Ligand binder design. Structure first.
Ligand SMILES: CC(=O)N[C@H]1[C@H]([C@H](O)[C@H](O)CO)O[C@@](O)(C(=O)O)C[C@@H]1O
Ligand SMILES: [Ca+2]
Ligand SMILES: [Ca+2]
Ligand SMILES: [Ca+2]
Ligand SMILES: [Ca+2]
Ligand SMILES: [Ca+2]
Ligand SMILES: [Ca+2]
Ligand SMILES: [Cl-]
Ligand SMILES: [Cl-]
Ligand SMILES: [Cl-]
Ligand SMILES: [Cl-]
Ligand SMILES: [Cl-]
Ligand SMILES: [Cl-]
Ligand SMILES: [Mg+2]
Ligand SMILES: [Mg+2]
Ligand code: NA
Lengths: 57, 281, 48, 264, 264, 57
């Protein structure tokens, strides 16, 4: 049950993971999660604000 | 997935005014350079890999230093040096605590690692055979040791690790063990409602997470009986949050901590150094 | 109790508890009895 | 015709109008909602009081002066004596609620000043004694609709018994962080030249589906004068700030006799 | 296996068992229900408190003696201080409710006696002065869970001010009709040799869809000893009668501040 | 002869087992067995008892 995944690039390929333990808590770090939605903090407004339009009309 | 590339843009002369906004709305400024200057095309190959929560928290941090000793104890005080108990917390140190407290709530598994060191208390009391340590996790309710060699150390159900001095730092994983759906880093409340005309003391009660938090106890002993040479030991406890989720960001701690709460110290509430002038580069 | 003894090998519990009452008077004894569970945060009940 | 400045909010038998709004904030982009079966915890059929409780309650007004350092409330504490919301809160062990918070402050085109209006999850504040930590009385933590005020000085008590209140130090947001960073929390600004009101819609926020409202405040409401009130004809003028809050999607579990908290 | 004598009733967090019932009455053959849109009157979204209020409340017990002439209560008056039902009743101008009435009285196979248990719509009773007509104080008309007692004598007051209570004369059902005809009202009998309980399920009954609960009692509950309590070893023995009532399909309109009736 | 099985869920997949020893006594813990029949202790009655029916008819 080997997972083959992309490595993080260095100066100049893939790596293999096998989980040895029956508990997911034993696993190595979660894979890179690039998810983001800054707008829930930077723009949590009820009515859409178009950048090119006046903020207050 | 990469950070934003810059598009090729020239000038404008337009009723479109992306440079103006109204932050009264609760929206941050949104304008980017292409809105207010002429820009070249720049392909951005750079990523935010190292600022993901897993990357930010992906370090074993020291959270406490425990002490235990092994010698022929003839007093109550010296008997209590043969083992130690520690209420598990991240508030004995400041560095991991401050990083966690960017968030109100979290959910993670824990990697715990230990670094165990010894020194001789004295010379001319001979030597000491290599020591084995027991680190016993005592969940809330399980009996706590009152002596280094009492019945509790048989540890039939509590997890224990037996560590041999000089071996690789011992390590184990702990699941997300919270009784809520996440850990609370902050709790604006009390453990019970004090009621009208009750006789229960209201003068010496506490507030916040300290009234409700209990992650149990780490108990440590040297398993060996005493040598003629007294050995003193330090156990450094390391925590790494892994498989991390966090919610509800907070301003970070700006002034020294003075305990387990958010309290501040009167002589340490001036973090800024005054500038000579508002016009100082 | 058997439930209490099992719970003292664990740190956390969840779910509903069943309280069953057996009346051991004579067959000729009658009565009506109120059995109550009051969730916490108010004056503990000392009156019906 | 429709404007970011002009808004009507109706909940139950109550309506708010504003003609000088600045949009509205939905905290973390999430509208409040009822608790789904797949996230539920207590198993008793909940009370959902709907229009009896999910309506605008107007708190006692406070006076904004050139010397004001700011105001705080906790929720649901500020609404604990508000009509049927208060009754449902105290008759049940468990409750959850979202809110519409409407902060009201009008002046004139000749006045100036700016209020930061922040909704803070788990707004834990510092105590006022250095003899103890986390040493705040229930009564001082839960002032109700009167809320509390910030100070620009920290004077912790000589005796532990006299310091069982919040050290609400304005520039440390009463909790050891710099007030300039409070904008990471859901917020609006009432800048008197621009707007006369702030509207924040808050979902339930907690590490649990539902909790003990009488033990635990989910939100702090902070109003800080970021720029002091100024009025050239009278520097000593006062203008009211009025706070109006509607519970939303209220749900209660664990009915029994009424909770009557200690008042001393 | 199933028996007319053995019954379980569950409403909200409350359950009743009986092992010596005699069927159950559904007054006028009609189960209670919510108010249909085609029969509605007040237009505000109603409060339907459901399990918070629609549950068994047990009144203070009364003692049946060989000399007892009987007991009366009014509904919703008897439940006005009962948990969240009372709170919903007094926070609203308007309310409607059905009821499950469970009257409890056990003895032994050696005791004898029979209680008539009657649910009376608009149970209007005579006043106790002949200087006036219809001259009863609000306080005397609305005793709450303690209810009142019947007498076998009529002694109207010398002065009008002293007679502002019911003349609850047993054989005239306190209202100028013969008690033997009370069986035209929904009823059961607790005959100690047969049964230890009466169960009556009552729909809302009125000339209106919904009404002012604090002004108007929809039902009287009357318990009359038709055959006196007798026990050969002790003619002075007393056995309790316990009344347990659950509101059902409760619906309230016209929310405002709480009604606090006069107590004198 | 690798077994791939579901892990116990943590805060936020599968694991691999190979048996190295010729005796089953050497094996790690038995896999979670959720089997139960409380009725053999809570209701060991000869004649079926329907909850809604009288216990004694
Ligand atoms: C912890 C500590 O300071 N230990 C020191 C001891 C203690 O002072 C004992 O009391 C007396 O042996 O004294 C030494 O001279 C010794 O024994 O060689 C040096 C040693 O480092
Ligand atoms: Ca704009
Ligand atoms: Ca451009
Ligand atoms: Ca030892
Ligand atoms: Ca409802
Ligand atoms: Ca409802
Ligand atoms: Ca049964
Ligand atoms: Cl050391
Ligand atoms: Cl041992
Ligand atoms: Cl926990
Ligand atoms: Cl400088
Ligand atoms: Cl209040
Ligand atoms: Cl009453
Ligand atoms: Mg009030
Ligand atoms: Mg009462
Ligand atoms: Na890019």
């Amino acid at each position: 049950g080997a997972q083959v995944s992309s490595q993080k690039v260095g100066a100049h390929v893939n790596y293999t993971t096998i989980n040895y333990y029956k508990d997911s808590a034993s696993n190595a770090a979660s894979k890179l999660d690039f998810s983001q939605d800054p707008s829930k903090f930077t723009e949590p407004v009820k009515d859409i604000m178009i950048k090119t339009a006046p903020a207050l009309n | 997935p990469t950070a934003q590339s810059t598009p090729l843009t020239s000038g404008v002369n337009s009723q479109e005014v992306p440079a103006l906004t109204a932050v009264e709305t609760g929206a941050s400024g949104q304008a980017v350079p292409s809105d207010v200057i002429e820009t070249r095309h720049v392909v951005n190959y750079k990523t935010r890999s190292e600022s993901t929560l897993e990357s930010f928290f992906g370090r074993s941090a020291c959270v406490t230093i425990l002490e235990v000793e092994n010698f022929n104890a003839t007093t109550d005080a010296d008997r209590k040096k043969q083992f130690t108990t520690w209420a598990i917390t991240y508030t004995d140190t400041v560095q991991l605590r401050r990083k966690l407290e960017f968030f109100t709530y979290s959910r993670f598994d824990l990697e715990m690692t230990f670094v165990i060191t010894e020194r001789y208390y004295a010379s001319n009391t001979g030597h000491a055979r290599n020591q084995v340590y027991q680190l016993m996790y005592i969940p809330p309710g399980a009996p706590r040791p009152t002596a280094w060699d009492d019945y509790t150390w048989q540890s039939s159900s509590n997890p224990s690790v037996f560590y041999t001095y000089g071996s690789a730092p011992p390590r184990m994983s702990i699941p997300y063990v919270g009784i809520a759906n996440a850990y609370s880093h902050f709790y604006d409340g009390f453990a019970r409602v004090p009621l009208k005309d009750e006789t229960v003391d209201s003068g010496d009660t506490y507030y916040g997470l300290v009234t409700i938090n209990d992650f149990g106890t780490l108990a440590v002993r040297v398993v060996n009986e005493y040598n003629p040479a007294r050995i003193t030991s330090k156990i450094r406890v390391y925590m790494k949050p892994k498989h991390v989720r966090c919610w509800c960001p907070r301003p970070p701690r700006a002034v020294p901590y003075r305990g387990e709460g958010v309290d501040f110290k009167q002589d340490s509430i001036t973090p800024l150094t005054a500038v000579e002038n508002i016009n100082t580069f | 109790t058997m439930l209490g003894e099992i719970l003292n090998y664990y740190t956390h519990w969840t779910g509903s508890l069943r309280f069953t009452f057996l009346f051991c008077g004579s067959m000729m004894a009658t009565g009506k009895i109120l059995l109550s569970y009051s969730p916490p945060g108010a004056k503990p009940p000392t009156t019906r | 015709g429709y404007s970011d400045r002009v808004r009507q909010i109706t909940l139950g038998n109550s309506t708010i109008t504003t003609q000088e709004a600045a949009n509205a904030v939905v905290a973390y982009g999430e509208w409040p909602s009822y608790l789904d079966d797949k996230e539920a915890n207590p198993i008793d059929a909940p009370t959902e009081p709907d229009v009896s409780s999910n309506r605008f309650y107007t708190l006692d007004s406070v006076q904004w002066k050139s010397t004001s350092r700011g105001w705080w409330w906790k929720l649901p504490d500020a609404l604990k004596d508000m009509g049927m919301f208060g009754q449902n809160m105290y008759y049940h062990y468990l409750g959850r609620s979202g809110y519409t918070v409407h902060v009201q402050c009008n002046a004139s085109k000749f006045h100036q000043g700016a209020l930061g209006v922040f909704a803070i999850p788990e707004y834990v504040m510092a105590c006022n004694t250095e003899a103890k930590t986390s040493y705040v009385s229930y009564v001082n933590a839960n002032p109700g609709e009167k809320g509390g005020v910030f100070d620009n000085a920290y004077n912790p008590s000589a005796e532990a018994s006299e310091g069982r209140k919040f050290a609400a130090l304005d520039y440390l947001l009463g909790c050891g962080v710099l007030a300039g960073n409070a904008f990471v929390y859901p917020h609006q600004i009432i800048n008197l030249r621009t707007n006369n009101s702030a509207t924040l819609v808050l979902p339930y926020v907690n590490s649990l589906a539902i909790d003990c409202m009488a033990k635990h405040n989910n939100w702090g409401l902070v109003i800080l004068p970021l720029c002091k009130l100024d009025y050239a004809p009278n520097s000593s003028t006062e203008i009211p700030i009025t706070v109006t809050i509607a519970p939303m999607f209220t749900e209660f579990n664990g009915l029994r006799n009424i909770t009557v908290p200690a008042t001393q």
